[PDB]
Amino acid sequence: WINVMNETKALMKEVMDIPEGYEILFFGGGASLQFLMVAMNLLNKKACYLDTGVWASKAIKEAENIGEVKIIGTSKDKNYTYIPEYQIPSDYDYFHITTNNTIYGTEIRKDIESPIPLVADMSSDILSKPIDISKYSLIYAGAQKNCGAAGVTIVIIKKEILGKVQRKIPIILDYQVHILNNSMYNTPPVISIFTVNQTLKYIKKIGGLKKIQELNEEKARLLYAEIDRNKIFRGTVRKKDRSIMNVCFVMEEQYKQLENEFSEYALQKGIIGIKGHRSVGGFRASIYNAVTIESVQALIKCMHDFEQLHT
Amino acid sequence: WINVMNETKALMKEVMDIPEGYEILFFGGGASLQFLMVAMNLLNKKACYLDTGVWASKAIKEAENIGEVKIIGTSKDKNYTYIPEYQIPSDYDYFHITTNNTIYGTEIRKDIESPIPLVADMSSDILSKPIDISKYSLIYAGAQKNCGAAGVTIVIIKKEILGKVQRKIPIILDYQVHILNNSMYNTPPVISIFTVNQTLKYIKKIGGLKKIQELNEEKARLLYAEIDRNKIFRGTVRKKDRSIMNVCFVMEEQYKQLENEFSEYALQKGIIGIKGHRSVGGFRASIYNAVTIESVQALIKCMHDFEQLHT
């Protein structure tokens, strides 16, 4: 509905500092529909992508169906534990990144510079920190972060980038049409958003994106310090690439045998939901926006006590 | 927070007609944590389950780790296109069903009778129709329906069923403890729910669960009628088991060759998001609570026009 959407737009502008020249769109269809719409709308001759995990590789695959794609770095060689070095080529139509790779615990934390239009999938991390929206040509966030509603996918788009593709774009997939019709052309459930309004209202209430990041940074910093001091565990991700939202860790070499015992020790101390993805093993602490500082400290104490128990 | 949770509880009681003797709990962890908690808390000697799809089979697998499980029917033989016949044995600790099997387009639409405590995973369908909550011992709904927030999992539990398991239940997994502590022991993000409050407020606003079901029934009935009259398509699910929320259909035998052409024809008429799961193929119309009547009619017209074009 026009009023919930329109209020959500003004909350987004305010909370995220979105300046003129950007349109906000709400879609059904999850991130996967954006994987398609991004390429349909922006890939005229060729695009480039950075492959930093599962969702990056899915966005890549979808774009490959539309046209020429150059993957200018992949960290797949070491199971996605770092963000590759890359040089953005100046002759491509756009550069697509995925800024947080949830199950691998890596993140691109800064707003990078780019010689060509920058597209970012911020599905996991969109309202976790301030963004300099001016550096981006298109930011999107959906489908499935994490395990919730049919849901809405947000698109923030610098309208001037559109119009360059020669291919005929079906109307339902053309960003211009959705912009022209105020994001009312093929709406998602009003309930599917109605939440975002609330969520933005909460972020504003608690003190804003800067506050939220400063809190996540503090939590991540306390946990990685423990993982770094603690002889039983090892962080899997290269330091400079460490996510502050998803903190991946595994047993040190000598102690791979204690992996099940720690899961149980932590269970008995009331700590669950830390099992790493199948493809990483070990563990993964999800530091949601306001998971508290205190429960990270409880995981830290549990890790420390476990260490002392086995030395 | 106590006030959002507590308001949500009173909205749930009212919207769902939840009588005394039932506790409402909110958890982090998705449906998968309930797969574990259900068995941990209720499986003393043995339980029985009905295998009607992916999530049913996951709940089964998890319970199998805890103790003896009898699968009293499975429709896996025909790729889950029907709900099996079964007889609930009277000597098991509980019977677990999954009432809507999203990707297969099947549903158990009635509240069934049972000689033993009835547990139902209603993750996709919990607020889609009135329920006679008295027939159930435990209803839960999470993790991931469909593609949204970190989210909350709802548990509605007939408190008198608890206490029968001899196994020592870790505190964090013990429903009694969560009940005792008003669902405040290990809370999910307040934002993770805050939505449900809104969603319930909307259901109430629009006229309630009965209204919503009557609308879904009407939509499903118009679409299955077209699928039934229309020579190009076939419903994959046995009539009596047809879901009113997820409507699966495939090309008729003579026309399997036109499957891609129809997807494109529908695209050009503005119709997307109907691709069937990988494991069914064909198509699947998601009739969300208020997807409109009108867009189902638009799919119907598109199907009909396509039929005329190829005869």
Coordinates of C-alpha atoms in Angstrom, one line a residue, chain A residues 30 33 58 143-152 170-173 185-186 189-191 194-196 198-199 202-203 264 267-268 270-272 278 288-290, chain B residues 30 33 58 143-152 170-173 185-186 189-191 194-196 198-199 202-203 264 267-268 270-272 278 288-290:
Chain A
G30 CA 14.1 -12.6 -3.8
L33 CA 15.2 -12.1 -9.5
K58 CA 24.8 -17.6 -8.4
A143 CA 15.8 -13.0 -0.8
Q144 CA 16.6 -15.1 2.2
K145 CA 18.4 -13.5 5.1
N146 CA 17.9 -15.4 7.1
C147 CA 15.1 -18.0 7.0
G148 CA 12.0 -15.7 7.2
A149 CA 9.0 -14.2 5.2
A150 CA 8.1 -14.5 1.5
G151 CA 9.5 -11.1 1.8
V152 CA 10.5 -8.1 -0.1
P170 CA 10.5 -7.6 -21.2
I171 CA 8.4 -5.0 -19.5
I172 CA 8.1 -6.9 -16.2
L173 CA 11.9 -7.1 -15.9
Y185 CA 3.6 -2.4 -11.0
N186 CA 3.8 -5.9 -9.6
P189 CA 2.6 -8.6 -0.2
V190 CA 2.1 -5.5 1.9
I191 CA 2.9 -7.7 4.9
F194 CA 5.4 -3.9 6.5
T195 CA 8.1 -5.2 8.6
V196 CA 10.8 -3.1 6.9
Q198 CA 9.1 -1.4 11.6
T199 CA 12.7 -2.5 11.3
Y202 CA 13.7 0.4 15.4
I203 CA 17.1 1.2 13.9
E264 CA 28.2 -30.5 23.6
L267 CA 25.1 -26.9 24.5
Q268 CA 25.4 -27.5 28.3
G270 CA 23.3 -22.9 27.0
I271 CA 24.9 -22.0 23.7
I272 CA 23.4 -23.2 20.5
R278 CA 28.5 -28.2 6.0
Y288 CA 23.0 -10.2 14.3
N289 CA 22.3 -6.5 14.7
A290 CA 21.7 -6.7 18.5
Chain B
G30 CA 14.1 -21.9 12.5
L33 CA 15.6 -26.4 15.9
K58 CA 14.1 -33.6 7.6
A143 CA 12.3 -21.2 9.7
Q144 CA 12.1 -20.2 6.1
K145 CA 8.7 -19.4 4.6
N146 CA 9.6 -18.0 2.3
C147 CA 13.0 -16.4 1.8
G148 CA 12.8 -13.6 4.5
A149 CA 14.2 -12.5 8.0
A150 CA 16.4 -14.3 10.5
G151 CA 13.0 -14.6 11.9
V152 CA 11.1 -16.2 14.7
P170 CA 19.6 -30.0 28.2
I171 CA 18.1 -26.9 29.7
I172 CA 18.3 -24.8 26.5
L173 CA 16.3 -27.4 24.7
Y185 CA 15.2 -17.4 28.2
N186 CA 17.1 -17.2 24.9
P189 CA 15.7 -10.5 17.8
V190 CA 12.8 -8.3 18.7
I191 CA 12.8 -7.2 15.0
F194 CA 8.0 -7.4 15.5
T195 CA 6.6 -8.2 12.2
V196 CA 4.3 -11.0 13.5
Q198 CA 2.0 -6.4 12.4
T199 CA 1.0 -9.4 10.3
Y202 CA -3.3 -7.1 9.3
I203 CA -5.1 -10.4 9.3
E264 CA 8.2 -17.0 -22.3
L267 CA 6.8 -13.6 -19.2
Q268 CA 5.6 -11.4 -22.1
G270 CA 3.9 -10.0 -17.3
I271 CA 3.7 -13.2 -15.4
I272 CA 6.7 -14.4 -13.5
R278 CA 13.8 -28.5 -9.9
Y288 CA 0.0 -16.2 -0.9
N289 CA -2.5 -14.9 1.6
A290 CA -3.7 -12.0 -0.7

